[PDB]
């Protein structure tokens, strides 16, 4: 039926409706640190989120997205392996039912508690719909979350989750500063990939940060209390909404650090 992360509609079944699942540049992938090539020609990332305008947070089944006003170059990502300017459109997480799993990308086979994806689209394409039909249409900034000390900048997100417990629910979410979610170092790995959820389009330049941010057990606990189901339907906890690592194939992971 409609795709999900359960036994009968999970990742292993997506190929039946989305053939691209067995494609050449699928994500996520495992990052083998000893095989990633240090590329000194990579520029530093330029994250300009000072004028970010968040608007809403919503539970779309699958996960919760915090949306931003992308009608103007307010919050952008440039530099790194990117050519052109990419506007932030939304951010979401993938997490697990236990602290030992949750991330989509893995580092030397190590899974983290969750992973944050900051989605940006290439402005040269006019709108996100066009951008998804291009090889360099999207840039997703991936940040790993480890369980440890609480992340202050994440608390506003955590407190509003009760308002969007079920699928289809949304809440006004203005004045949120995404800069509060970045680690201190911007060192990263990069490779050409795809969306990790259907349509699974291969239009993404992945930029995965080396340094994870730490969040408290209590903070991660609250993510786990969300529901995949809509109001009135039988409760299905939103946990393990992650796709397992895909084969790297003919791709090379570059690193911006030595
Ligand atoms: N986890 S991840 O790889 O960062 C990621 C990021 C964005 C999207 C998305 O915007 N879906 C929109 C969308 C549709 F729902 C249908 C067709 C095209 C789309 F762009 C999906 C997965
Ligand atoms: Hg594409
Ligand atoms: Zn994601």
UniProtKB/Swiss-Prot annotation:
Result of changing residue 195 to F: Normal activity
Residue ranges occupied by any Alpha-carbonic anhydrase domain in the UniProt entry: 1-257
Sites of Phosphoserine modification: 163, 170
Listed cofactors: Zn(2+); Co(2+)
Protein's UniProt keywords contain Cell membrane: yes
Binding site for substrate: 196-197
Claim: Phosphoprotein is one of the keywords in the record: yes
Catalysed conversion reaction: hydrogencarbonate + H(+) = CO2 + H2O; urea = cyanamide + H2O
Pfam annotation, one family: Carb_anhydrase
Effect of residue 104 to A/Q: Strongly reduced CO(2) hydrase activity
GO cellular component: apical part of cell; cytoplasm; cytosol; extracellular exosome; myelin sheath; plasma membrane
Effect on the protein upon substituting residue 104 to D: Normal CO(2) hydrase activity
Class of enzymatic activity (EC top level): lyase
Modes of activity regulation: Activated by X-ray, histamine, L-adrenaline, L- and D-phenylalanine, L- and D-histidine, L-His-OMe and beta-Ala-His (carnosine).
Record's signal peptide: none
Binding site for Zn(2+): 92, 94, 117
Effect in UniProt of substituting residue 60 to D: Strongly reduced activity
Result after altering residue 65 to L: Reduced activity
Phenotype upon changing residue 62 to A: Reduced CO(2) hydrase activity, rescued by 4-methylimidazole (4-MI). Reduced proton transfer. Enhanced proton transfer. Enhanced proton transfer capacity
Site (Involved in the binding of some activators, including histamine and L-histidine): 90
Outcome of swapping residue 16 to E: In Jogjakarta
Active site: 62 (proton donor/acceptor)
CDD domains reported for this sequence: alpha_CA_I_II_III_XIII
Complex formation: Interacts with SLC4A4. Interaction with SLC4A7 regulates SLC4A7 transporter activity. Interacts with SLC26A6 isoform 4 (via C-terminus cytoplasmic domain).
Protein name (record): Carbonic anhydrase 2
Native organism: Homo sapiens
Gene (UniProt): CA2
């Amino acid at each position: 039926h409609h795709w999900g992360y359960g036994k009968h509609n999970g990742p292993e079944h997506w190929h039946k409706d989305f053939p691209i699942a067995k494609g050449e540049r699928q994500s996520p992938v495992d990052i083998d640190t000893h095989t990633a090539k240090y590329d000194p020609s990579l520029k530093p990332l330029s994250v300009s989120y000072d004028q970010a305008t968040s608007l809403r947070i919503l539970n779309n089944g699958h996960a919760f997205n915090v949306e931003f006003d992308d009608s103007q170059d307010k919050a952008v990502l440039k530099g790194g392996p990117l050519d052109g300017t990419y506007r932030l459109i939304q951010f979401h997480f993938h997490w697990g039912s236990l602290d030992g799993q949750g991330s989509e990308h893995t580092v030397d086979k190590k899974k983290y508690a969750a992973e944050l994806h900051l989605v940006h689209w290439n402005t040269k394409y006019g709108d996100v719909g066009k951008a998804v039909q291009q090889p360099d249409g999207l840039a997703v900034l991936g940040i790993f979350l480890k369980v440890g000390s609480a992340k202050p900048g994440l608390q506003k997100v955590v407190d509003v989750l009760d308002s969007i417990k079920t699928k289809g629910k949304s809440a006004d979410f203005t004045n949120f500063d995404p800069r509060g979610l970045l680690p201190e170092s911007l060192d990263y790995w990069t490779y050409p990939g795809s969306l990790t959820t259907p349509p699974l389009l291969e239009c993404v330049t992945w930029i995965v940060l080396k340094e994870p941010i730490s969040v408290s057990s209590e903070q991660v606990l609250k993510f786990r209390k969300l529901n995949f189901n809509g109001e009135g339907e039988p409760e299905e906890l939103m946990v393990d909404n992650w796709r397992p690592a895909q084969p790297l194939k003919n791709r090379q992971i570059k690193a911006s650090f030595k």
